[PDB]
Structure formats: C-alpha cells, structure tokens
Design a protein around this ligand. Structure first.
Ligand code: 5KP
Length: 149
C-alpha cells in the first residue's frame, strides 16, 4: 500500500521538538517538555503540576519539524481514565511546508465532569492517546501517561 508507506515517510521525517502548557488566562508557564512524544510504541510519561487542574483552560504550544509536505495536518486526541474516555479533542494545523519547523498554539478545555475529579484520583490513571493525521491518513499513534504532581 502506497498509503501505508506515505504515512511511514511522513513519520520518519517528523518530530516534536518541544511543547509548553500555560494557564490560558494569565499566560504563565505550567509545564514544558523536550522529548519527542510523536514517537509510537513507547508509553511516554508527563509529570505536570497539579495547579493545572485549577485552570478554566490551558494554552498549549507544539514546535515540530517535518521533512515531508503535509496537506492537512491534524490531531485527534482522546483522554482515558482507567480505559474510560473522558475527552475527545480535535485540532487542525493545516498545510505543512516540507522541511519546515512550526509552532502551533491550541486552546484546551476540559468538560465539567473532568474538572470534578481530583489530582489524587487522576494522577497515574490518565493516558492521552494522540493520533496524528495528514487529512484522512493515520501517520502515528502515541500515548502519554500523566501524573499530576
Ligand atoms: C486532562 C484534564 C482533566 Cl482529566 C481534567 C481537567 C483538566 C485537564 N486538562 C489537562 O490535563 C491539560 C493538559 C493537556 N495536555 N497535557 C499533556 C501532557 C499533553 C501532551 C503530552 N500532549 C501531547 C501528546 C502527544 C503529542 C502532542 C501533545 N498533549 C497534552 C495535553 O494536551
């Protein structure tokens, strides 16, 4: 399949260089990471301060590079608590220039039901599954276990 291999080429040339999380209201940093969490197969770990749970919302910034051109680069994310899906998030970036590096800012809001759970119950039991697409085409699937510390 040309589709599978195209997806593979995109992945070989892609990485996430860093990300941030800010309080969306003040703009102050909460957490930042430098490991490439695009990487599938490994369960990644993220130890994020629990004050992030006391946020109406979070601003997130991803810096990534891609050798491959992408037509409509986007993300589907689902957040799981003990295998139960709490959130279902979508983000489009769009067209990506080949061999570019890009910063991308997204607003991240949780549902009330999510907000009704404490760090003590969430910590270690949350997994963000991140699906990276170009349009209709799955490039990579990574997962991150979160601790609220
Ligand atoms: C999740 C949540 C609950 Cl359950 C209740 C109340 C608020 C929240 N919101 C958060 O925890 C905000 C953190 C959002 N967040 N945290 C991390 C660690 C993220 C990572 C690693 N990613 C990410 C993963 C793979 C590739 C790109 C970004 N997105 C994240 C991401 O969107």
């Amino acid at each position: 399949s040309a589709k599978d291999e195209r997806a593979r080429e995109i992945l070989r040339g892609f990485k996430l260089n860093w990300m941030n999380l800010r309080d969306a209201a003040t703009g102050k940093i909460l957490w930042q990471g430098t490991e490439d969490l695009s990487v599938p197969g490994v369960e990644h770990e993220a130890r994020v301060p629990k004050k992030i749970l006391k946020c109406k919302a979070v601003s997130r910034e991803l810096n990534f590079s891609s050798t491959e051109q992408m037509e409509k680069f986007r993300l589907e994310q689902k957040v799981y608590f003990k295998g139960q899906c709490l959130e279902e998030w979508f983000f489009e970036f769009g067209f990506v220039i080949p061999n570019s590096t890009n910063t991308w800012q997204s607003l991240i809001e949780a549902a009330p039901e999510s907000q009704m759970m404490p760090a003590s119950v969430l910590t270690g039991n949350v997994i963000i599954e991140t699906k990276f697409f170009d349009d209709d085409l799955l490039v990579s699937t990574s997962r991150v276990r979160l601790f609220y510390v």
